[PDB]
Design a protein around this ligand. Structure first.
Ligand code: VIV
Ligand code: VIV
Ligand code: VIV
Ligand code: VIV
Ligand code: CL
Ligand code: CL
Ligand code: CL
Ligand code: CL
Ligand code: CL
Ligand code: CL
Ligand code: CL
Ligand code: CL
Lengths: 231, 231, 231, 231
């Protein structure tokens, strides 16, 4: 059985110095005021999962990366805060990091920003923005190998401009903005695995979201134990 | 009743150091040779108001910013100087800064540059250009949250290139150039509130200009007292 | 009519440098993370007032100081947080600072710590503790001329030890601990003005608390305007 | 299942640097000449346990701290050395550190120094004294939240004066000396949980000692494995 350290080693190519620094930040990144709680039980965000906000593709990309999909239109900012939504990503991340192949080949993100509103942007404070940059760079044992933004409205770059200065050069050149005509370019990066809504052949986003919702609910006891092991 | 200092505090998030520096510049920015007078009575620029050069939307943008509209085609450079036109903005600014919600949520500018001529550019000397940059950055207690240029002719960037080096990074990334196809992108930033000429639903620019002209004329006694309180 | 600056000048013996620094801290002390809101309306803490937690003596001490009394036993930590309780002191402070004689002769505090529990101490985090020290020293335009602790249980000094290192030498030598046998020594500091419960002759704490509760409720519109003038 | 590192992280509020330094000292503190062995089997100190020298309260204090009681009168210095007695505390400590709530809320100590003799003091050499200070400060993953000395004879401070210079400021202000009249003040710190001998209501020290003796004997195999894992 793997140590807790092994996922941090694999995240930094078995460089013990870098893995150690990542481990340090992993334990303190939440503590940055205002803090986000260590609670990882799905009960407070099950509405988000049911709304079809988020899902994970069952198949990997050509490099073996786990592929995550987020749909901002299914996040109601009146009901769920940025911290609720961030907690969903933390829950997903703690689950997929258990896979060794994900530890080795990292992850890729697809953000459908269609329906992004100013109400969404209101949630993204400078404190939240730098927390976003933290988990994307050096505060969580997952290698972000690519970030793909699709259907981005012009009003979004104000939010991105808040996040950008806290991003490393490595992650910045891994961010792709495809616009409303995303299908061809997105298909190039992710052949055979995309859902129907994004140019895929077989599965729909609804099934993908429901499947991941079930997996999260099913893993609620592991999530509770992880929450216990970081406080 | 608010002190005179409160609008400067709100302009700099109640940082007394920064508010103090802003207050210092507010009193000396006009004095930069060649100086612009402290006269704020509308009698010398009523022709500009009647020509429909400028107006303020009655409703705020999604973030609560006051929205100002300028139309360069309605400025006759043969009749009014750059100082006359600048005085119009000063008059408007001293009026809208009285609103606490504007003090908190700042302003956004829409410049219809359709009909911009070389005769307009002739008025924009280096001295005028840096005065423009001064009030936009750190010489007036109003937070410029966005500048939107529409219908910009290619000959305009020479003027913008004069202004740019005196602009901070903050204000530079808040400037948007939409070109002649501005409607969709402008509507994204300003839903429900734009006039008919710019994709809106109800009000026309003429009514908006006339309404603001009336408010300025109505406020002529307050404007005189402000002019007295800065000299 | 006095400026807003005058209360800060009187707080620092008309030293403009010191008054200015106090004014700076007055605007930023709440902002220290985690922040306490600027809300000063009594609606959220009326239960505390009705419980008889706090009251102000109608007569001043021999040096002209306003005298405040707090009773920790009437604070239910299950119902009200430390921030609720702190807000009560802020509300009282913004009201009594309006009196010029209080601006000149400062205030004195009497804390009846009888009934202090660990549940009370649980509310006093390091962040709260340093906020306490801030308003007591150089973040509010009121001169704390004396702090009198009575009926202090032995378990309280742990809390005081949290506050002490953030206290100046001036305020530390103005703190008095009288124990359970407080009457004689307390009477020396405050002749003729104490309530019946603390060795006084005429008024009871209940009447004093009810009288101050009424004054706070009566001043709810001024409190709202103050809250507006600091945000 | 928790790593071995987790108890050190919880001991230093998940500060990886501080937890690492604590882990370093945990492995080397015994090695300080003259060394104390890593033997943790109760067979060599069962006489001490049977003599009623030491026991652990079944209920926690109001802050969730585990409460330990030592009775110096039940230590015969002719039969057991300081190293034997120290080993008893090590055995107890390695057992109670397994509880997560103890890892989070630390421990508190009650030392009944009634019957302290010069024969006891003879055992406390400078080397022993600094070993005492080591485990109390930064050499064992248990947070000492309070040390309560009761019935201390005047001849004891000579011993305490040997220990004091090696103690941090944090632990020094957590040491309480109650004297022979300890009951009221001790009851304040530890309501509802004290034994009959110290003002409690239900349980006697004899039962408490016997209960902890049984738990130690019952845990003899875990104690052997721990001894194996540090050499
Ligand atoms: C380990 C890990 C975490 C924890 C994670 C992400 C990736 C990770 O590997 C991606 C998303 C994020 C940062 C949560 C973001 C929460 C926000 C509030 C919702 C999205 C709103 C953004 C304004 C729009 C997309 C931002 C992209 C530029 C990432 O959480
Ligand atoms: C407080 C305040 C003032 C005083 C103000 C503006 C905004 C403010 O918040 C915007 C406009 C400006 C700077 C007056 C400009 C006067 C010139 C002569 C007319 C416009 C000609 C410009 C070449 C074209 C638009 C320039 C934009 C880049 C601002 O006056
Ligand atoms: C301007 C001003 C404020 C704002 C003020 C006080 C005096 C002021 O002049 C005294 C009280 C305090 C600091 C509020 C304290 C709130 C706490 C949570 C309740 C009391 C609990 C303390 C652990 C016990 C008494 C502390 C004394 C040592 C002050 O608020
Ligand atoms: C992890 C840990 C250990 C290991 C520990 C204690 C507390 C801990 O958290 C308290 C007691 C001690 C230090 C053992 C002390 C052994 C001596 C020889 C017996 C007591 C004699 C002392 C002269 C009198 C009491 C000293 C107090 C000031 C601690 O062992
Ligand atoms: Cl939270
Ligand atoms: Cl845009
Ligand atoms: Cl002029
Ligand atoms: Cl060109
Ligand atoms: Cl609050
Ligand atoms: Cl005590
Ligand atoms: Cl030995
Ligand atoms: Cl003596």
């Amino acid at each position: 059985t793997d140590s807790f350290l092994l996922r941090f080693l694999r995240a930094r190519d078995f460089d013990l110095d870098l893995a150690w620094r990542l481990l340090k930040n992993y334990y303190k990144w939440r503590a940055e005021c205002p803090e986000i709680s260590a609670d990882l039980h799905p009960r407070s965000i099950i509405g988000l999962l049911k709304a079809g906000y988020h899902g994970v593709l069952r198949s990997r990309d050509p490099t073996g990366s786990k592929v995550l999909i987020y749909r901002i239109a299914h996040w109601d900012p009146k009901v769920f805060t940025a911290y609720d939504v961030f907690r969903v990503s933390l829950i997903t991340s703690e689950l997929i990091v258990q896979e060794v192949e994900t530890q080795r080949n990292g992850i890729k993100l697809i953000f459908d920003l269609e329906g992004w509103q100013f109400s969404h942007a209101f949630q993204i404070t400078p404190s939240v923005a730098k927390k976003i940059a933290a988990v994307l760079t050096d505060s969580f044992p997952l290698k972000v190998r690519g970030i793909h933004l699709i259907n981005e409205p012009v009003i979004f770059h104000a939010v991105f401009s808040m996040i950008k200065p806290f991003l490393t050069e490595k992650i910045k050149e891994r961010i792709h903005m495809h616009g409303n005509n995303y299908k061809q370019s997105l298909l190039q990066h992710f052949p055979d695995i995309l859902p129907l809504e994004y140019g895929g052949e077989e599965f729909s986003m609804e099934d993908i979201c429901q499947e991941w919702t079930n997996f999260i609910m099913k893993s609620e006891d592991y999530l509770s134990s992880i929450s216990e092991s970081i406080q």
